[PDB]
């Protein structure tokens, strides 16, 4: 890349020297050396870029967000200076956007990428990176407009196809998403070999009846994305024991299980009381997992945080669960009531993480019509009995009874997770 303008060429020696100290690993000596060059040559783009890059490296060594915030500002200063080479301008602001996302300043990254796409209107890779910005903030409509433009200029961009297909699939355009996801993955372009697109292509195929879904599940497994054709979670810790169905003894959570089964009617009655007197606290499932039916959930704990208002509706149940941090502290699971009505079929799906196990306590179980498949075995609920499975495996649910089915869902940390992993793992 051409990063030295005319003036920077007259001082290339002084610049390469400081870059040497950085490449060697003496960051503190390089920040001071680029800082002195910026003092001496206030309009040098390469010297400003070097200071920002040394600040970037220093923040990593210290794990400092304050230092990284400084590098982000220095990266912008490179773009305010005069006669900045175009390769240097793009590198500086792309890194600004990238590191802006690591801190969680998504709106800042978006603004930086918008400026990049305006300064360089013909670089499709930047528009593609801007579409990711919109996806990370939850704006699927603006990400759609972007990838449509990319495909209208470069029709064979695989990165844009998979992302466009991902958007269409999230909009419930299952039939329309399959061609974009499949071609995008087959393109082999950079960024297309991602587990998310294998996951969503097979699911789309499974929904329209196409039996080729498992071939894509198999490919994702062979390419290291999925741990198995059945276990297709993507936010995983490797090494944890993996089986569809668990027994209470296998989990080691015998006290939690005994407590739920000994006191099950109490948990049932508080949930029925909310159904009768506070139905609005039951919220519909909003993840597009149903083919048909009514599925609603009343959530007491999520991401290890207690819903104060919900626990006022189920006060005794919440007091009971406080004694068991294996579930109340599961920052990758929930504790919730779940009601399903007749005529409901939940598509085959997996949960996001392998770091939890899911317990089902039966509360109101119709005698017929209710069944849950996990992997290749189908089981039924029983009132007052706990059922334990790993929802990271593909599971499917039917409700073809004559009345409603109420269960209590309790997520626990996977038993083989160390106490440290249980405190560090980001929440889901």
């Amino acid at each position: 890349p051409k990063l030295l303008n005319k003036f920077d060429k007259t001082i290339k020696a002084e610049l390469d020297a400081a870059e040497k100290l950085r490449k060697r690993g003496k960051i503190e000596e390089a920040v001071n050396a680029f800082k002195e060059l910026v003092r001496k040559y206030p309009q040098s783009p390469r010297a400003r870029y070097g200071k920002a890059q040394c600040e970037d490296d220093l923040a990593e060594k210290r794990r400092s967000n304050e230092v990284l915030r400084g590098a982000i500002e220095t990266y912008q200063e490179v773009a305010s200076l005069p006669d900045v080479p175009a390769d240097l301008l793009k590198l500086s602001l792309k890194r600004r956007s990238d590191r802006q996302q690591f801190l969680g300043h998504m709106r800042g990254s978006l603004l930086t990428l918008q400026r990049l796409v305006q300064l360089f209107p013909n670089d499709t890779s930047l528009k593609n990176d801007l579409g990711v910005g919109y996806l990370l903030i939850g704006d699927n409509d603006n990400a759609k407009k972007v990838y449509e433009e990319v495909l209208s200029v470069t029709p064979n961009d695989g990165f844009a196809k998979v992302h466009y297909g991902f958007i269409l699939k999230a909009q419930n355009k299952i039939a329309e998403s399959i061609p974009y996801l499949k071609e995008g993955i087959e393109s082999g372009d950079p960024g297309t070999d991602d587990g998310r697109f294998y996951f969503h292509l097979g699911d789309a195929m499974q929904r329209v009846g196409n039996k080729e879904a498992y071939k894509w599940y198999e490919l994702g497994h062979k390419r290291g994305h999925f741990a198995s054709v059945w276990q297709r979670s993507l936010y995983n810790v490797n090494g944890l024991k993996a089986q569809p169905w668990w027994t209470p003894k296998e989990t080691g959570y015998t006290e939690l299980v005994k407590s739920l089964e000994r006191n099950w009617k109490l948990i049932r009655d508080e949930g029925l009381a909310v159904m009768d007197k506070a139905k609005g606290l039951f919220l519909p499932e909003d993840e597009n997992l149903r083919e048909k039916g009514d599925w609603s959930q009343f959530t007491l704990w999520q991401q290890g945080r207690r819903n104060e208002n919900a626990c006022k509706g189920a006060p005794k149940t919440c007091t009971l669960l406080e004694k068991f941090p294996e579930t109340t502290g599961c920052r990758r699971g929930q504790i919730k009531y779940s009601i399903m009505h007749p005529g409901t079929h939940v598509w085959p799906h997996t949960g996001p993480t392998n770091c939890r196990l899911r317990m089902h306590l039966g509360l109101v179980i119709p005698k017929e019509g209710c069944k849950i498949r996990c992997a290749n075995e189908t089981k039924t609920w029983e009132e007052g009995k706990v059922l334990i499975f790993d929802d990271s495996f593909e599971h499917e649910v039917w409700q073809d009874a004559s009345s409603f089915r109420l269960i209590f869902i309790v997520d626990v940390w996977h038993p083989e997770l160390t106490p440290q992993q249980r405190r560090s793992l980001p929440a889901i």
């Binding site: 969680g104 990370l136 597009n288 799906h349 929440a427 889901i428």
Partner: peptide
């Protein structure tokens, strides 16, 4: 958020170091 499924482009949230 990713509760029962994996429908979001990202299920986690970045907060820096």
């Amino acid at each position: 958020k990713c509760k029962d499924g994996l429908g979001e482009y990202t299920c986690t949230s970045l907060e820096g170091f």
